[PDB]
Short mmCIF file of C-alpha atoms and ligand atoms in Angstrom, two decimals:
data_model
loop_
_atom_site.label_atom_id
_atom_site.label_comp_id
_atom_site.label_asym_id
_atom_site.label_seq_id
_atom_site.Cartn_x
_atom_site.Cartn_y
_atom_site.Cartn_z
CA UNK A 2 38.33 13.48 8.57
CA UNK A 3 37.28 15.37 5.18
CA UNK A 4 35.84 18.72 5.34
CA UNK A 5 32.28 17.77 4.38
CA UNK A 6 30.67 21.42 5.80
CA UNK A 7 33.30 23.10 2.89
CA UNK A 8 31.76 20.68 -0.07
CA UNK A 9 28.16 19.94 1.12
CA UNK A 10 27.01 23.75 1.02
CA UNK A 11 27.62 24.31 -2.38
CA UNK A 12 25.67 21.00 -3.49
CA UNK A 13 21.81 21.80 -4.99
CA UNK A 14 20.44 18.92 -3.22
CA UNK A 15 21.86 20.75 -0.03
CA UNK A 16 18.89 22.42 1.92
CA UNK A 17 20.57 24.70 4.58
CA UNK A 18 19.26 27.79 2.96
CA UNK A 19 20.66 31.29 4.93
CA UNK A 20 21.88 28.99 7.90
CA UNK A 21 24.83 28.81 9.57
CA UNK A 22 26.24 24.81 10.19
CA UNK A 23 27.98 24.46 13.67
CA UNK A 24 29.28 20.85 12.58
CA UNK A 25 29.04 18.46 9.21
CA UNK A 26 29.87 15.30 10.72
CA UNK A 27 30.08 11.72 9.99
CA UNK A 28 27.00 9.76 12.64
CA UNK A 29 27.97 6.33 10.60
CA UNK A 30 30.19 4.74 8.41
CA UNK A 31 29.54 1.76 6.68
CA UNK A 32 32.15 0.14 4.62
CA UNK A 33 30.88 -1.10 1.19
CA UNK A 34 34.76 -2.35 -0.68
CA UNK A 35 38.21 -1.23 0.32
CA UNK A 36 37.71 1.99 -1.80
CA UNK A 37 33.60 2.27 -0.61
CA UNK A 38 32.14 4.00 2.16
CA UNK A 39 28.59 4.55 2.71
CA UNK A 40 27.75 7.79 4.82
CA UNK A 41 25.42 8.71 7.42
CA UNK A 42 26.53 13.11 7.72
CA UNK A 43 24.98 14.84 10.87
CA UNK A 44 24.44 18.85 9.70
CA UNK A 45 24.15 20.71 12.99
CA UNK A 46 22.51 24.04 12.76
CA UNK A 47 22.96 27.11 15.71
CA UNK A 48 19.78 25.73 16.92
CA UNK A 49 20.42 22.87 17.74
CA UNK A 50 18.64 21.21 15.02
CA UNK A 51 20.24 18.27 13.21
CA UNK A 52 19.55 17.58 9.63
CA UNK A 53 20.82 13.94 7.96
CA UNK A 54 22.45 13.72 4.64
CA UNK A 55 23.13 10.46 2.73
CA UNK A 56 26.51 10.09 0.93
CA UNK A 57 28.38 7.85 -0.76
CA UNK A 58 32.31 8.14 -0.86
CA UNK A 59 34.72 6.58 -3.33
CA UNK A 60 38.65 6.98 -2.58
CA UNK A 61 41.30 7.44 -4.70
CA UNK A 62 44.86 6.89 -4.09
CA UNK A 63 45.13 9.46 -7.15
CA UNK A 64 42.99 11.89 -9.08
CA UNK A 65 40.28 10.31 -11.45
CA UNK A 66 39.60 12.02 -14.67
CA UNK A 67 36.12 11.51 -14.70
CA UNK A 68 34.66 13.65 -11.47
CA UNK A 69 33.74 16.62 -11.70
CA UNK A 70 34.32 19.25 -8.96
CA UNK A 71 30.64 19.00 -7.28
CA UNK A 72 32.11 15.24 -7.28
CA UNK A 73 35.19 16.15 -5.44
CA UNK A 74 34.59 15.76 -1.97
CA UNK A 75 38.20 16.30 -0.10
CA UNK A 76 41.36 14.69 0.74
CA UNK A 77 42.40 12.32 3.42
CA UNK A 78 45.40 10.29 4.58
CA UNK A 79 44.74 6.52 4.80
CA UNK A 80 46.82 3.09 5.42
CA UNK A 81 48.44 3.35 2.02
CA UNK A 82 48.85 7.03 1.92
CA UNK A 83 47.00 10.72 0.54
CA UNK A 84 43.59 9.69 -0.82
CA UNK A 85 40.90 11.47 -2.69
CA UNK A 86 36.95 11.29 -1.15
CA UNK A 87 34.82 11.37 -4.55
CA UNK A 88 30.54 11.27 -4.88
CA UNK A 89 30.67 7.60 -5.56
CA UNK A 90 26.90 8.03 -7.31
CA UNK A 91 29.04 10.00 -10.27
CA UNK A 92 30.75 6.58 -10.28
CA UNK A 93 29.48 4.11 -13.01
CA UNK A 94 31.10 1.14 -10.88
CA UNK A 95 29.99 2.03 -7.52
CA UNK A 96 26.67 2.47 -8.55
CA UNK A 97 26.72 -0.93 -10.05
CA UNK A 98 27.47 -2.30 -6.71
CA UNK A 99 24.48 -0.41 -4.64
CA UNK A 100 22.50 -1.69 -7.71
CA UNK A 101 24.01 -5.36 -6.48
CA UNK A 102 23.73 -4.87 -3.35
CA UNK A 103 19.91 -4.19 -3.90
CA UNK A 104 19.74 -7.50 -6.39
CA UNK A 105 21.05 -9.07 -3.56
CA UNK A 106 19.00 -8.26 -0.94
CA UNK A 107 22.12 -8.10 0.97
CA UNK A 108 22.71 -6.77 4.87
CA UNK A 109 25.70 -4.65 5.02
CA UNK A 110 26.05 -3.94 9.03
CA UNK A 111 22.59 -1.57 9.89
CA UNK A 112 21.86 -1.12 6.22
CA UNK A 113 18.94 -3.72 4.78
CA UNK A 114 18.99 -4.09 0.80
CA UNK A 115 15.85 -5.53 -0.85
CA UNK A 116 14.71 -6.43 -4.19
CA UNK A 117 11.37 -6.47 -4.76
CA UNK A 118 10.03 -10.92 -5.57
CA UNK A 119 10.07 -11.74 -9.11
CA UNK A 120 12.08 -8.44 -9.90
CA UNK A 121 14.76 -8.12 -12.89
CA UNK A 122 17.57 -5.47 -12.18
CA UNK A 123 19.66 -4.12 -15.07
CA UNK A 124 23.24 -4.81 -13.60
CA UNK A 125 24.76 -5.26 -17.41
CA UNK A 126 23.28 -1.65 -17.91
CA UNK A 127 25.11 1.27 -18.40
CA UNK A 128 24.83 4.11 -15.47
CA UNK A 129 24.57 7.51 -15.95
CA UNK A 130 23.38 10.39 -13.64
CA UNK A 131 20.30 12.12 -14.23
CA UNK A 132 20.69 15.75 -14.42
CA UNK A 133 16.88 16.29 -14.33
CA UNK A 134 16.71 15.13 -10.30
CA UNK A 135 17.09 17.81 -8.07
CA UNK A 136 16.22 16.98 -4.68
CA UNK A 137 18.19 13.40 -4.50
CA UNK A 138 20.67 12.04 -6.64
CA UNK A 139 19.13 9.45 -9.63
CA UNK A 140 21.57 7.16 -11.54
CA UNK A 141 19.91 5.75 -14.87
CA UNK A 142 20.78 2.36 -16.19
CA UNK A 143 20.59 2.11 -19.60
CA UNK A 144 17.07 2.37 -20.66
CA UNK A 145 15.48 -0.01 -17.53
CA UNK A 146 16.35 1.19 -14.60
CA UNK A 147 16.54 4.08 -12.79
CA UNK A 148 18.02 4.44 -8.67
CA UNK A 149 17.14 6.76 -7.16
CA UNK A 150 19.36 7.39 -3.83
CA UNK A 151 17.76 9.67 -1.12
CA UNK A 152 20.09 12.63 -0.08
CA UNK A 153 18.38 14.27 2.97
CA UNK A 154 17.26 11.33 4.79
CA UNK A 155 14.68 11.21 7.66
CA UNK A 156 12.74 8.89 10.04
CA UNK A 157 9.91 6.47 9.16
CA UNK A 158 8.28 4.97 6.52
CA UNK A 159 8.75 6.59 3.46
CA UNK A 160 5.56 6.90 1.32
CA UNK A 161 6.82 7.06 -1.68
CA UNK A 162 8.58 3.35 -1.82
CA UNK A 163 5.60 2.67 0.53
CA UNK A 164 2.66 3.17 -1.96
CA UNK A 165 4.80 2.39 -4.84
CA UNK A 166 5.47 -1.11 -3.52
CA UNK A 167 1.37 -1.55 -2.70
CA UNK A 168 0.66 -0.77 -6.36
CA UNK A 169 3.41 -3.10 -7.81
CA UNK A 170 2.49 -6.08 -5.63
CA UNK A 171 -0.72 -5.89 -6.25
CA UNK A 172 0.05 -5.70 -10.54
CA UNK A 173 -1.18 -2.33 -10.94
CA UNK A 174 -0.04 -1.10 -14.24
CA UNK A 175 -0.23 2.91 -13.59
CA UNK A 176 3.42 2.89 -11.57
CA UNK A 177 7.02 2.80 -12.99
CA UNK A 178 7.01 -0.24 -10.81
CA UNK A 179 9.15 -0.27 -7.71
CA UNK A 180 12.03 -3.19 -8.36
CA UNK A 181 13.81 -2.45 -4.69
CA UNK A 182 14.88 -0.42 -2.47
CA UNK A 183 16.82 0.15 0.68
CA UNK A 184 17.15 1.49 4.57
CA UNK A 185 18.61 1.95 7.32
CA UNK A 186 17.82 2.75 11.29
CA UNK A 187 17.64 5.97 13.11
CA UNK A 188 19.71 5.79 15.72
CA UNK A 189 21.66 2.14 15.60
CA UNK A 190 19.74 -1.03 15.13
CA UNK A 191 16.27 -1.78 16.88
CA UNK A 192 15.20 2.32 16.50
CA UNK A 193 13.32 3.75 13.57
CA UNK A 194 13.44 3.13 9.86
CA UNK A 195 15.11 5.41 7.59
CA UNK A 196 14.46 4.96 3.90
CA UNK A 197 17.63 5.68 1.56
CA UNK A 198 16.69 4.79 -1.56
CA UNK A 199 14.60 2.89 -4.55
CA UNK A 200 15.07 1.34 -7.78
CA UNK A 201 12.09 1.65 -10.52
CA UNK A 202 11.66 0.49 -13.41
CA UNK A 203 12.28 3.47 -16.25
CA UNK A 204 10.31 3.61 -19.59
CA UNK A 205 12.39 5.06 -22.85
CA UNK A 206 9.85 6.95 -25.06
CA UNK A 207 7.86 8.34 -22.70
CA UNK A 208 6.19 11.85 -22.62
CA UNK A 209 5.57 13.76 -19.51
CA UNK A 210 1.79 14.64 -19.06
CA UNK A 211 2.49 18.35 -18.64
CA UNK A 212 4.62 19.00 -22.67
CA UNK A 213 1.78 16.84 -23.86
CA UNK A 214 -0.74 19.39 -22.61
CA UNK A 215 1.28 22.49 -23.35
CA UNK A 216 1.37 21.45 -26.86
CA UNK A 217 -2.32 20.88 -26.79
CA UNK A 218 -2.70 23.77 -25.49
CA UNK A 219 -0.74 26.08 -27.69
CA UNK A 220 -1.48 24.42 -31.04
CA UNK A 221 -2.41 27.70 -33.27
CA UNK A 222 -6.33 28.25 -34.79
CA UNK A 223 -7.20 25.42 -32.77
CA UNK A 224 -10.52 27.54 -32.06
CA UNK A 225 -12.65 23.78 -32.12
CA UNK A 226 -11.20 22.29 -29.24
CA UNK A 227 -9.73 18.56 -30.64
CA UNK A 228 -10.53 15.05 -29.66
CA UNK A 229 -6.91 13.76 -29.53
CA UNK A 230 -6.10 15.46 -26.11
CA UNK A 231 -9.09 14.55 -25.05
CA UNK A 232 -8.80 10.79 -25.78
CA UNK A 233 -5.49 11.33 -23.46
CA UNK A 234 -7.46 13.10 -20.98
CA UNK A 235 -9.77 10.60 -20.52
CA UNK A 236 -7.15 7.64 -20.18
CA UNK A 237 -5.28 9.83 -17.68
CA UNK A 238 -8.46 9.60 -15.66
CA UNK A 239 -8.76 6.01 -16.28
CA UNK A 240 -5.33 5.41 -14.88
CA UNK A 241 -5.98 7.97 -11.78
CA UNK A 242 -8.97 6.18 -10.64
CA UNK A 243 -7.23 2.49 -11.28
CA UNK A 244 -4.92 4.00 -8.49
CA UNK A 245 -6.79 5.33 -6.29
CA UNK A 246 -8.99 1.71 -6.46
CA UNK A 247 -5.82 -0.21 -5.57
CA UNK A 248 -4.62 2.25 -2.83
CA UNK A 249 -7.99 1.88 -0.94
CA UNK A 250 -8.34 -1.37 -1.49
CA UNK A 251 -5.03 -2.28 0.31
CA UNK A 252 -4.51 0.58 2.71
CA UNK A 253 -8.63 1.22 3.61
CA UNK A 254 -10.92 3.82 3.61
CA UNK A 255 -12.53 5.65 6.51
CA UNK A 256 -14.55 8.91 6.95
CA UNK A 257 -13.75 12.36 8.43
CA UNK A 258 -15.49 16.03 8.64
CA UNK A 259 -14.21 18.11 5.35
CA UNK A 260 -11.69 19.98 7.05
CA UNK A 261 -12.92 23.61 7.27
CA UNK A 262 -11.00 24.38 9.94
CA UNK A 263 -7.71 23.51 7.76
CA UNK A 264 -8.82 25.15 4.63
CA UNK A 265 -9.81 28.28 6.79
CA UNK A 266 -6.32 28.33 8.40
CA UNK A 267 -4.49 27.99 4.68
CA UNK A 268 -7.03 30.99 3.11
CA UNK A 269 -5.90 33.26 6.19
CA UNK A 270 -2.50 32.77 5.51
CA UNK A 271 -3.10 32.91 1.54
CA UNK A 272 -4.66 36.46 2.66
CA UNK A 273 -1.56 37.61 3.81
CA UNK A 274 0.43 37.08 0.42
CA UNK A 275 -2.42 38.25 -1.70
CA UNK A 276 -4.33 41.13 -0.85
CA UNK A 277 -6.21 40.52 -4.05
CA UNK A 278 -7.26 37.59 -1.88
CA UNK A 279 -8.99 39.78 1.15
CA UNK A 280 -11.99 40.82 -1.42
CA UNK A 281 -12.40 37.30 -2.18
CA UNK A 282 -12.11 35.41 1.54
CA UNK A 283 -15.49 36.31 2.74
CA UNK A 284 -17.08 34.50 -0.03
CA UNK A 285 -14.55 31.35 0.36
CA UNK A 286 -14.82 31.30 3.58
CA UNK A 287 -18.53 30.94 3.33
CA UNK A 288 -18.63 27.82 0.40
CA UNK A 289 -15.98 26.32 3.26
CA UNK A 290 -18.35 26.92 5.91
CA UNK A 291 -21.18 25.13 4.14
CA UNK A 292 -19.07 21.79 4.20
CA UNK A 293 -19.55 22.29 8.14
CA UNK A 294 -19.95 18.80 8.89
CA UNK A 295 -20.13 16.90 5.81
CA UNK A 296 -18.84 13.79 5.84
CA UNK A 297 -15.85 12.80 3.12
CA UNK A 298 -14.06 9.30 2.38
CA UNK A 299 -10.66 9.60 3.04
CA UNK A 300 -8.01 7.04 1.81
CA UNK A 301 -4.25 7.15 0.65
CA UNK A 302 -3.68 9.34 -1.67
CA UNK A 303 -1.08 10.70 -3.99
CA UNK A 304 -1.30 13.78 -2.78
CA UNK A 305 0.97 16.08 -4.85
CA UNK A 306 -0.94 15.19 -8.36
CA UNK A 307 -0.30 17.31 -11.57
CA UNK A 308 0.43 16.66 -15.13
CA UNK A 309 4.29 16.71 -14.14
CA UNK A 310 3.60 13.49 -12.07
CA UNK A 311 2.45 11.67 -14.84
CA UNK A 312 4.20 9.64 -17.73
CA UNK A 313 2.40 8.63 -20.80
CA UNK A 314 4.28 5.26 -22.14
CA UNK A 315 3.32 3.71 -25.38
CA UNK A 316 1.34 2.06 -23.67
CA UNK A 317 -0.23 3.84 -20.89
CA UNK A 318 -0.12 6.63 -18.56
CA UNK A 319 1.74 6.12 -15.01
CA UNK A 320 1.78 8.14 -12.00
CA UNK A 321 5.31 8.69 -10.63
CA UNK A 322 6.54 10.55 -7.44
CA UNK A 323 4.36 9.62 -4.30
CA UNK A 324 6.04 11.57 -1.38
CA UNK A 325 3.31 13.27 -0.56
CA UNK A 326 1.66 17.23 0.06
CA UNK A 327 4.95 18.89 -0.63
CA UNK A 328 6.01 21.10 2.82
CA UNK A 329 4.68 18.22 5.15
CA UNK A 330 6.28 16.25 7.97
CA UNK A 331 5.85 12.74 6.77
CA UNK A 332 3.26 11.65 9.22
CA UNK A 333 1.57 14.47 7.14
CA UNK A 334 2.02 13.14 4.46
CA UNK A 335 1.26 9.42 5.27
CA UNK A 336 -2.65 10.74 6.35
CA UNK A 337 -4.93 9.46 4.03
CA UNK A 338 -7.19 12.27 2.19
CA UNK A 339 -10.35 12.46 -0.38
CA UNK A 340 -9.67 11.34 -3.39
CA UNK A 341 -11.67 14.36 -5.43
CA UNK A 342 -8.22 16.54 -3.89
CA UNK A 343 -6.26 14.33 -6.44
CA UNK A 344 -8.70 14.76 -8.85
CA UNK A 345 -8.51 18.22 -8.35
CA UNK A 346 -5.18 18.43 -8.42
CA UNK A 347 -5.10 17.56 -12.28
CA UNK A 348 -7.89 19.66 -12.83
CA UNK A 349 -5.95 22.96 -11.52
CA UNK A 350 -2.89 21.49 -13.61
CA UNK A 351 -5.17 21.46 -16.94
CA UNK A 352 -5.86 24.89 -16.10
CA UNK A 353 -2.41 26.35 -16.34
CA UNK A 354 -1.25 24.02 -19.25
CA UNK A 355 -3.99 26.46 -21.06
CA UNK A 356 -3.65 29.53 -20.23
CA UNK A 357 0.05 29.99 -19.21
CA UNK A 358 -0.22 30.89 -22.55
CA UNK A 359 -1.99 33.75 -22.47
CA UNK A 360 0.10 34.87 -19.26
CA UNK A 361 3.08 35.15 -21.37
CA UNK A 362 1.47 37.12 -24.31
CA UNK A 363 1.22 40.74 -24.56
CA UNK A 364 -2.53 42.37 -24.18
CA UNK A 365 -2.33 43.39 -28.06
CA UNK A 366 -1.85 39.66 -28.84
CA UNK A 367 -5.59 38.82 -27.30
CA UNK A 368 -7.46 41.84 -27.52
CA UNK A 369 -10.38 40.37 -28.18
CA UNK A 370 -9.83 37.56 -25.45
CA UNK A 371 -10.42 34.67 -28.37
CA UNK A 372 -7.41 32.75 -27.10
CA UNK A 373 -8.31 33.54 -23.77
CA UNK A 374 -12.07 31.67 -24.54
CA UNK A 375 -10.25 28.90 -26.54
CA UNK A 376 -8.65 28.05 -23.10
CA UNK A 377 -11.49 27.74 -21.64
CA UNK A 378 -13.00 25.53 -23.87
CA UNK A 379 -10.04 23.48 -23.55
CA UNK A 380 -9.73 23.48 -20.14
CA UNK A 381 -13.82 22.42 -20.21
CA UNK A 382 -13.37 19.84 -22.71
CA UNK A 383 -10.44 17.86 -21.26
CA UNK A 384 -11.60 18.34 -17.44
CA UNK A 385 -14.91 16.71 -18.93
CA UNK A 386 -12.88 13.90 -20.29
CA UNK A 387 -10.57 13.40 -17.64
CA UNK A 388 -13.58 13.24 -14.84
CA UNK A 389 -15.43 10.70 -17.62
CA UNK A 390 -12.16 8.76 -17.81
CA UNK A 391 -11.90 8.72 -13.66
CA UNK A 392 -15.92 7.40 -13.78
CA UNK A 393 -15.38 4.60 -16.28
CA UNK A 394 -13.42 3.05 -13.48
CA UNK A 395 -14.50 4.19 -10.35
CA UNK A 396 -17.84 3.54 -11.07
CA UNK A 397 -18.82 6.83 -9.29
CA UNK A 398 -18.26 9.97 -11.47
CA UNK A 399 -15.73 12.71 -8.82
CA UNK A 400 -18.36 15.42 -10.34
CA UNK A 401 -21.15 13.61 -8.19
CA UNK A 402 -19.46 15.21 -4.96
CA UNK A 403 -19.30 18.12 -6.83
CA UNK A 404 -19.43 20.56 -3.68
CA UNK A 405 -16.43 18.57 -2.11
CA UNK A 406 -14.57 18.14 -5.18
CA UNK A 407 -14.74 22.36 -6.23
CA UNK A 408 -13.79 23.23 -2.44
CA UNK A 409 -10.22 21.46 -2.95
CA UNK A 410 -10.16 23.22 -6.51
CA UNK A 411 -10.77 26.23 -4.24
CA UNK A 412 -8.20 25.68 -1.67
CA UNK A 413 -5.88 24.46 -4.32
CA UNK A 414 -6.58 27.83 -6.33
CA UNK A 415 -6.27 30.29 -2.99
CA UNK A 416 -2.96 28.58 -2.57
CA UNK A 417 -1.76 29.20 -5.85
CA UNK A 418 -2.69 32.54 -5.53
CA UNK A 419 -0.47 33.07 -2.70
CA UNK A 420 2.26 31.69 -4.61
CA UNK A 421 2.62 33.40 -7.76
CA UNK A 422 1.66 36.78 -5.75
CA UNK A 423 5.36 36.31 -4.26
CA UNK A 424 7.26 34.65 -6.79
CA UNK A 425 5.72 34.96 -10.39
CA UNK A 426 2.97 37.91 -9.89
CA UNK A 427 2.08 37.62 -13.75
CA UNK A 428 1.13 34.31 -13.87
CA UNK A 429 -1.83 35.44 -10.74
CA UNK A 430 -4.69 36.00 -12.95
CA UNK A 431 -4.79 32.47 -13.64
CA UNK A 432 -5.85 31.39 -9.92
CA UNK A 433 -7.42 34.72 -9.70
CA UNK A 434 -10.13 34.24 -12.35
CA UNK A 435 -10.07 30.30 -11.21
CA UNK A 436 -11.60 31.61 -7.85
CA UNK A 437 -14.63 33.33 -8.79
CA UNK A 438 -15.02 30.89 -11.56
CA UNK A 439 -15.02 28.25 -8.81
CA UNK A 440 -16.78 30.28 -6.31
CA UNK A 441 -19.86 29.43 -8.63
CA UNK A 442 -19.09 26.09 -9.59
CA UNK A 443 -19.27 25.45 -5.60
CA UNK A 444 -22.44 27.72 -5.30
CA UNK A 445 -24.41 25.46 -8.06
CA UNK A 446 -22.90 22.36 -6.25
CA UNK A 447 -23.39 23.16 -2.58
CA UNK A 448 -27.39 23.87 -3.80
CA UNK A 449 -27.19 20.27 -6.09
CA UNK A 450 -27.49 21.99 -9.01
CA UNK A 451 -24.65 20.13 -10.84
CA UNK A 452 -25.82 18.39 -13.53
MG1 MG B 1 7.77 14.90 -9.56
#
């Protein structure tokens, strides 16, 4: 009995938006120590719907300095008296023991810990929450490890321990490599799998891909468009297409119709956010149209890939964060796809590392629109790069499909559209002048006129 509805709405990780909870209840409790519960919490909406939320409780017989109040969970009497329910991930010990627990590979009643053969976990290390994660809680061990422990929690298997764990096993190098992780069941033992969380390995001195490009990007009288950034484009495609070769070799690849039908559907609704998008669908819906038929290789994916998914070591670039098309139920997201979307994922990402810039200037800072055409040449120069970088390895340059590869840039640009049209409406020229740049680049493709 703690009043988990009173604490759990005011948490960021919390998703319950507008709605009204009927009941926050406990659907398991797993003991852990004396002091130690693990926590399976049941949020029941008006509807009927039930979302389940993944926490952690450490009890005091007395207030602990060190929580703070999005730590403090409630009070309870117990055997020995009043006792205080704190987040136990804010606690340096009781993360320790999950991390243990993992080392261990240990059973605890219906939850299954496992660490990952020939793994090395950090248990000296010291933890600290991230502030940086959002969406779960992550607890950082010195400068080694990093758990990550899932906070809404759902049925089956989760893809992003799944394709991490494909890519370590098989000594892929492009991964902060997957060192454990750990589940539970649906509904009791024998039902589904729920995932709960993952321990990676965590690289000190790394540089996300996105500030890397920024600066690039915004380096002043950089009017001839540098090598440097390009060298790291290229490498960033190397390491894309290493990927992608492991995922299909391990989880196959098969062939589908491009989807027309489900880029059509996406542009309609686009339409609706954007009317600068209704003089525009005619001519997207015919390059869609064209693919009518065409046959695409489909395998797993990434399938949420921009420069923020991607760490540059000293050593090399990784690709972290492999839940999947962000918005999608998770068989959704466990579908395998075309590879050129990933690729053209990055290549919409160079796009706004360049020109955000000029997005945020006034018009009398680029009257002449010579910033505006030194994005473009960097935009040209690193896509060129990256797509050599992705060839090297692939042995198949993504450009070849050109016609497939600039209707995902499309789709990917039509969505964007939609998006900042609601929520940033300054930053829409960008995907604006990316779709009738595009609608050409298709046009040349769809006739084979890429080079
Ligand atoms: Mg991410």
């Amino acid at each position: 009995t703690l009043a988990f509805g009173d604490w759990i709405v005011h948490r960021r990780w919390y998703a319950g938006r507008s709605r009204e909870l009927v009941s926050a209840e406990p659907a398991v409790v797993t003991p852990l120590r004396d002091d130690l519960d693990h926590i399976l919490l049941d949020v029941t909406y008006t509807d009927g719907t039930v979302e389940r939320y993944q926490l952690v409780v450490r009890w005091a017989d007395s207030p602990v300095a060190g929580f703070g109040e999005a730590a403090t969970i409630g009070t309870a009497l117990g055997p020995q008296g009043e006792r205080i329910a704190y987040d136990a991930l804010f606690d340096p010990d009781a993360a320790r023991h999950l991390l243990r627990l993992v080392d261990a590979s240990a059973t605890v009643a219906d939850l299954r810990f496992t660490r990952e053969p020939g793994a090395t976990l950090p248990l000296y290390a010291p933890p600290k929450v991230s502030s940086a994660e959002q969406s779960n809680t992550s607890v950082i061990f010195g400068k080694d490890a990093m758990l990550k422990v899932f906070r809404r929690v759902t049925p089956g298997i989760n893809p992003d321990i799944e394709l991490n764990r494909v890519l370590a096993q098989a000594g892929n190098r492009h991964v902060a490599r997957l060192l454990g992780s750990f589940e539970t069941s649906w509904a009791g033992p024998g039902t589904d799998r729920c995932a709960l969380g993952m321990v990676t390995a965590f690289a000190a001195n790394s540089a996300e891909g996105w500030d890397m490009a920024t600066a690039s990007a915004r380096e002043m009288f950089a009017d001839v468009v540098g090598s440097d950034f390009a060298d790291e484009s290229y490498r960033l495609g190397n390491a894309v297409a290493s990927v992608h070769a492991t995922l299909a070799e391990a989880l196959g690849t098969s062939t589908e119709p491009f989807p027309v039908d489900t880029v059509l559907a996406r542009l309609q609704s686009a339409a609706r956010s954007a009317p600068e998008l209704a003089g525009r669908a005619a001519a997207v819906e015919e390059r869609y149209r064209r693919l009518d038929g065409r046959a695409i290789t489909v395998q797993r994916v990434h399938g949420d890939l921009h420069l923020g998914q991607v760490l540059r070591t000293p050593d090399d670039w990784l690709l972290i964060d492999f839940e999947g098309e962000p918005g999608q139920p998770l068989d959704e997201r466990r579908r395998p796809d075309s590879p050129l979307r990933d690729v053209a994922g990055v290549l919409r990402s160079f796009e706004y590392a360049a020109y955000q810039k000029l997005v945020e200037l006034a018009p009398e800072q680029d009257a002449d629109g010579r910033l505006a055409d030194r994005a473009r040449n960097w935009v040209d120069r690193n896509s060129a790069a990256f797509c050599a970088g992705y060839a090297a390895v692939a042995g198949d340059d993504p450009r070849r499909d050109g016609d497939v590869l600039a209707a995902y840039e499309l789709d990917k640009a039509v969505y964007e559209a939609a998006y900042e049209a609601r929520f940033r409406p300054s930053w829409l020229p960008i995907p604006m002048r990316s779709i009738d740049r595009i609608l050409g680049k298709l046009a040349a493709a769809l006739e084979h006129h890429h080079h």
